[PDB]
Amino acid sequence: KKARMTVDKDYKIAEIDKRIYGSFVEHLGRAVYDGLYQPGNSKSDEDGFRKDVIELVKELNVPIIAYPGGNFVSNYFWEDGVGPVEDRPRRLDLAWKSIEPNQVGINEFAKWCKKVNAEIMMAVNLGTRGISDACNLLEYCNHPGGSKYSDMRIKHGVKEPHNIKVWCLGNAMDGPWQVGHKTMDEYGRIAEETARAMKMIDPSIELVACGSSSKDMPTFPQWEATVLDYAYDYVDYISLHQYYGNKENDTADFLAKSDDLDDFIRSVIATCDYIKAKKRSKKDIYLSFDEWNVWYHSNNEDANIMQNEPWRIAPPLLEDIYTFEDALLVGLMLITLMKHADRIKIACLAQLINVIAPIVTERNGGAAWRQTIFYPFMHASKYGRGIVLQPVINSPLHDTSKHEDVTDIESVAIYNEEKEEVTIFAVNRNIHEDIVLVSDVRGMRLLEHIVLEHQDLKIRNSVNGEEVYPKNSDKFDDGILTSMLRRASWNVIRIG
Amino acid sequence: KKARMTVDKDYKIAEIDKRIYGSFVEHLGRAVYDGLYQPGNSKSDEDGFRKDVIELVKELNVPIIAYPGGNFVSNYFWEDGVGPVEDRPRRLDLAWKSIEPNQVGINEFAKWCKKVNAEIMMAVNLGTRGISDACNLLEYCNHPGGSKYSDMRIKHGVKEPHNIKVWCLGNAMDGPWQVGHKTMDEYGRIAEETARAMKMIDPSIELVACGSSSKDMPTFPQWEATVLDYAYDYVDYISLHQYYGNKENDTADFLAKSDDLDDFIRSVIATCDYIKAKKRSKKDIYLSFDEWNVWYHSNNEDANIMQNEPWRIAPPLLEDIYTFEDALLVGLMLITLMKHADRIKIACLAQLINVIAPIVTERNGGAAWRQTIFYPFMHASKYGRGIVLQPVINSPLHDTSKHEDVTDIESVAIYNEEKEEVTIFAVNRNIHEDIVLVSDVRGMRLLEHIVLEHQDLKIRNSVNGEEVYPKNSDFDDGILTSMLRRASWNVIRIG
Amino acid sequence: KKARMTVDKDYKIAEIDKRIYGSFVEHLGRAVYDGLYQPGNSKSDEDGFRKDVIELVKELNVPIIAYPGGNFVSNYFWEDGVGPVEDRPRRLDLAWKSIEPNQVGINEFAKWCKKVNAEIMMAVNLGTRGISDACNLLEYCNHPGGSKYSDMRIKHGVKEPHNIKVWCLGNAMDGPWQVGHKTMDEYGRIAEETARAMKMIDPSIELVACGSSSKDMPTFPQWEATVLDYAYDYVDYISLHQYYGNKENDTADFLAKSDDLDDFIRSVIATCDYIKAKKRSKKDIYLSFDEWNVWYHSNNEDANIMQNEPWRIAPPLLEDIYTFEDALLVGLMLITLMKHADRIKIACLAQLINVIAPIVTERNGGAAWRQTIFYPFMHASKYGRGIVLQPVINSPLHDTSKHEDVTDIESVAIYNEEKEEVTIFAVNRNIHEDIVLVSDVRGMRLLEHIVLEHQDLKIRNSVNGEEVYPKNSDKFDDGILTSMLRRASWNVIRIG
C-alpha cells in the first residue's frame, strides 16, 4: 500500500537525447502502401500522403525515423526507388515474401519525413551489397553536387542534399531467416570497411553498427563485442532489438518483463565498456535502441500469408491490435529507457504506421486511428524532454509467474530546468491493489495528474472509438508530493 | 567356370530414381556450336537444331540435363545469353581458352530440352558471381511474372516460366586450374547463403552442393564434410565426379576400376552420414553423380589446342573416340550406379554431344553417329526403370595388376512391376575365360537376351559405321541359365 | 681522408634491369591536371600534353611508369575514364579528398606514355572491386579483338591493344587510412585468385603482389610472407615502399638513412626466400621497388587542404620543393638500389610530375623546371645501364645521432661491356670532412667526373633558375683511378 521515492535534482542520470522518441518505417506490409502513402485517397495530399496520418505522427513528435528496414534492407537496391517513377522496377522482397513496387523510395520518403517534422536514420544494404554501394548512396544523399551520384540526385528533382545525419551499417544479420546472413567476424569486417569509407565521403555523419537480432541468439553478446572490436573507431552506436509478448496470458509476469529489458541494456553497455578498455579509447559507444515494442498478437495470421498467399503487394502483415495492458508494458519500457538515458541516445518504436504500430489506417483507404500504445508514447515524448533524476525508490515487491522480487512501482522523474517543471512518469504494475506513491521533492507546485487506466486489461481501441485515452484528473501542496496510482495504471504527474 | 545368383522380388534395394539416366552439356568445344546447334544446316530445324542429334538423344531417354557447366559456369554471365541475339556479346571463356558467341543461352537451351523430352539442371556462377546473381537467374527462370527479371524473360519471348527443378550451387572450385577457386570454408559459406536466399524465392526447387572436383584431391572428403556442415538444412544433394582412362593399356585392370567407383560412392555416403549425426538431422543427403564417364583419349590433342590455338570458337576439345572396352567399363559404371540407387538419385553421363560423348557429329556441319558407349547407356535407361533387387551373387574372382579379388561377374536385377518384367544387367569382366550364370529366380518366362561383344577390345565406331552395337543371343523353372561371353555386356529379360 | 675500393669486372652482382629507372604517376594533385595534361596551353600539343614536360621525362630515360595509383586505384572505376569524354562522370576521390574529372584515363595516358618512350605498369582496383573487373580491364588492354572488352577498346578508337606487360594486384591496403583496407589473409586470397584468372587471359603478363605500405606497419613482413604464400605461383614480384624525411633537421643522420633502405631490401629478400623454401619452388620472387623518394616538406600544407578545402579538382598536394641534401639522399638511395640489382628488377621514383617530383610546372599553366633531385636520377638512369660489380670498399665510418658506424663514402661501379666504359657512382655523406677516391681498377683511361655540390645544403631550385645542376667540374694513371670527393657531394666518375 505504501511506496516511497526521494527525488533529488542534484542527483541526475543524464540529459535526454530527443532522438530516444524515434520510430521506424519498414517497406513491410501496409506501412507504406495503403499506409502513409495512398495516392488516390481523398484524405491524401499533393504527393499522395495521407494528411490524417501526418497529423497523428506530428502528435507523437518523433524527431528521427529509421528507414527502410529492417530485414527488407538486406536485399534492397536503393536505385530501384529513385528516378522517374515509370522506370522504377518491381522486385521480390524476400524477407516478407512480397512484391515491392518501389513507388515510394528515398526522395518520396524524405519529403514525408519533412511533413512529419522528422529526420531519416538511413540503413544501407550490407546483406547482398557492400562498400561501394553504401558510398554511392551516401554521396547521392549528402554530397552537394558536382559528382556522379550527387548530380544524379539533383537530376531526380532534389537540388539540395538530404544530409542524412545517422546511418545504420546494414541490419542485424545473425539469423537464418535473413538474406545475407553473416558470421560475427564477416559482419565485423564489412561494417568496419563501410564505415571507414563512408566517413571519408562525409565525416560529420554518425554510424550505427548492428547488434544481435535479439538477446536470445546464441551469438549475443559476442556478436556485439566482435563488431565493435573491428569497427570501434568508425562507429558511434550499437543497436539493441527487443520485443515482448503476452502469449502466456499472464498479465502479472508480462509487466515484469521491463526488468529483463533493464538487464539487457546493462549487459550491452558492459560489452561496450569491455571493448573500450581493449582499445584504450576515450570514446563511449552509445546505445541505439532502434527496434522495440510489444509484438505477439498477429503472429499466426502472418505465417499464413507467408507462405500461402505470397508475392502480394502490401499484404496486411504484423497487424497487432493492442490492448490496454500492452500500453502499460510500453510505458514501462519507456521508463526503463529514460532511466538509461546516459547511454541510450537513439531509440525507435517499431513500428510507426500499421505494422505493430500506434497508428493504424483501415484497409483499402480506411480511416486512421490511435491504438492504446499511442498514448504512453505521446506522453513520454511530450513531457520527457529534460534531465533524468536518479530513481531512489523503495516500493513493495511481489513475485510473479517466472519473475522474482518484482518492483510494484516503476518510476522516473524528468526535470526540465529549462522552463521550470518536473514530470514524474509512474506505473503501478500490481494488477490487484492500488498503491499510494508520494515524492520527497527535495528541491523546487502540483500541475496536473494525467492517468491511463481501465478495468478491462484486454480492452482495445479501434476505428470505432478509443477505450484507452488520457484522462487528466486524479487526486500534494507542501514539499512532499502525495499521489495514489490505481492498480495497472500509467500516470504523468507534473510539478512546476 | 560358373557363377551363381539369387534374385527375389521381396528383397528390394530401392526404386531407381529416373534421374540417374541424365546427362550433361557444357559450353565446351563442339557440344553446342558445330554440335547440337548448326543453324544454317540442311539437317537442322528452324531453331537450328540438328534433328539427327535430337533423335539420337531421345533414343537415350535422358530425363535431365546439366547445363551449362562444368568449369564454364564459374565465370559465365547469364545475361550475355538471353535477349536480342544481335545484342549479345562475345566473351572470353577462360576455362577452355575459347571464344563464346552466346548464340545459345537459357531460352535456346530450354527450347532444345523440350525437343528431347528432358529437364534442365541449372548451374549458377559462384566462381566470380554470388547470391544476388543466382537470385536474378532463379527469378528469371522460375518466377511467373510481375517482377523485374520474370517480366524480362517474358519480354524476351518466354511467357511461361521454365520452372527449373534442380540447381547446382556453382561448380567444383577446389582446383588450381579453375577460375573462382575457393577454400572449403569459402565455398561452404557461399553455398549456404545462396541456398538460403534461393529457397526464399522458390521453395520448391532442390539444390545441389558441389563436392570435390575428384576423389584424388587432397581435400577430399573434408570439402564435402565442410560444405554439408554449413549448408545442410538448405541443400538436397552432394555431387560426385569420376572419370577413368586406360593410358596404361591394361584392359583387365581397367575393367576392375568399377570397384573404385563403388568405394568412392560409399566414402561419400559415410561423409553424409557423419555430418547427419553431427546435425542430429532426420534428413539424408542424396548423391548426384553429375560427372561420370571414361575420359583419356583426347588429352594430348586438347593440350595442343591449349596452348597453341587459343580463342577459337568451337575448337574440337575432348573428342574421345571410344573403344569396345570403354563401353564395357561404362556398363560396369552404370551397374554400380544402379546398385546405389538408395542414395544416388541424379547422375549425368558427361557429356552428351561430341564432348567425351556417346553422340558425335563430324567436324564442320555433318555426320551424327553412335559411339561404343552409346549402347550400354541406352539399354540401362530403357530396361533399368523399376526397383533394384539386391544382387545375391557368388561369382569367381581374379587379381589384376593393381586390383585384388575382382568379381569376374557383376550384375543387378531391375523389376518393373508395371510390366511384370525383370531385366538383368551383367558384364563378364573376365577378359579371358567365359562364364555361365545360374540365377535362382524365386519369382516368377524369357523374352530376349541382348549382348554387346567383340573380338578386339580396341575396336571403335565411326561415321562410316558401327562396329559395336547390340545383337541377340542364346529359363524353364526356378532357375535361368545364361552363359556370358568373356568381356561382354548383357541385357537379359523375363516376362 | 682516405677510403678505398677495388673494382674487379668479374666480382659481379648482376646485370641492371632498366626498369629500375621507372616512375609513377597517380591521379593525385597536379600530376595530371595542371601538370602533364593541360589542354589549351600554348606549350601543349594538339592532344593537350605539355611538350616541355614530355621533354624533361625523355631526359630521365624512364622505361616504365606506374599508373594510376597508389591509393587512388583502390576506389577507381576504370570504365569512368574511357569512351567519349562527355559521357565520363566526375567521381569522389576518397584517398585525396578531390574530385576526379576523368578527362585523362588509360587511353590518354597510354598515348602520353608513347610520347615519352615508356610503358605503363598498370594497377587494378582490388580495394572496392575484384577478380572480374581485373579480367575485364586486362582483356580491354591486351586482347586483340573479337570479344566484348577488346571490341570496346577498338570502338573507343584504339585499334591495337596496349599490350601492357606488368600489372599490380591492387595497392597496399594494410593502412587504416586506405579505402578497401584488408587483412593480410584477405589480400593474399584475392591477389591469388586475381592473378590466377589474369594469367588465363594473357599468360605473358607479369604480376606484382603488393607488399606492406611501409616497413613500419606492425604487419610487416608477415603481410609479404602471407601474400606470397597464397599467390607464389602466379606472381613475379613483391613491392616495397620507402620514403625518408629530415624533419629532425639532422643532415648527418639524414644521409645515413640509406643504410636503413639497405636493411629493408634485405628483409624483403629474406622473406621471399623463406617462402621459396616453403613452396619448394625453383622460382625466385623479384623485387618491385615501386614507391621511393624523399618526402616531408609539404606535409603541413597538405593536411590543411583536407579537410579545409576538400573536393577541389587538382589541388596542389604534395608539392615538396627539394633541397640539395634531399638530392644526396636520392643519390644514396639510387646507389643502394643498384647494389641490389640481382633481386630488384623494377623501381619507381614516386612521383614523376609535380607530386613529390623531379619535374615541376608552376600552378595555372606554365613553367617546367628541374628540382634538385632531377639530376642524380638523370645521371643514374644514363650511365647506370650495364653490370653491377661488387664494391669491396674500406671507408672511414662516423656515427650520427641515431646511427652507428655509418660509411662515409657510399660507392658502386656499373660496367657496360658494350660501350667499353665503366661508371662509378659515389656520395661523400660526411658533410664536414673531404675524402678521396682512388679505386684500384683491376680492369682496365679517364673520361669524365660530373659532380653535384653546393655551399648551402638547403638550397632549392625554382622556375627562376637551377641553383643545383651537374657541372663537368672536378678532376687514373695506369690502372689505378684516383678522384677526390668533396663533403656532401654526388660524383659520377667514368673510365673508358
Swiss-Prot record, chains A, C:
One Pfam family, please name it. Alpha-L-AF_C
Superkingdom of origin: Bacteria
Q: Which reaction does it catalyse?
A: Hydrolysis of terminal non-reducing alpha-L-arabinofuranoside residues in alpha-L-arabinosides
Give the site residues for Important for substrate recognition. Answer: 295, 351
Residues of the active site are: 172, 291
User: Keywords for this entry?
Assistant: Carbohydrate metabolism, Cytoplasm, Glycosidase, Hydrolase
Protein EC:
3.2.1.55
Pathway as given in its UniProt record:
Glycan metabolism; L-arabinan degradation
- Recount how this protein's activity depends on pH: Optimum pH is 6.0.
Binding sites annotated in the UniProt record for alpha-L-arabinofuranose = 26, 71, 171, 243, 291, 351
What is known about what this protein does?
Involved in the degradation of arabinan and is a key enzyme in the complete degradation of the plant cell wall. Catalyzes the cleavage of terminal alpha-(1->5)-arabinofuranosyl bonds in small oligosaccharides as alpha-(1->5)-linked arabinobiose/arabinotriose, but does not display significant activity against linear non-substituted arabinan. It is also highly efficient in the cleavage of alpha-(1->3)-linked arabinoside of xylobiose and of the alpha-(1->3)-linked arabinoside decorations of polymeric wheat arabinoxylan. It exhibits very low activity against sugar beet arabinan.
Q: Mind telling me what this protein is named?
A: Intracellular exo-alpha-(1->5)-L-arabinofuranosidase
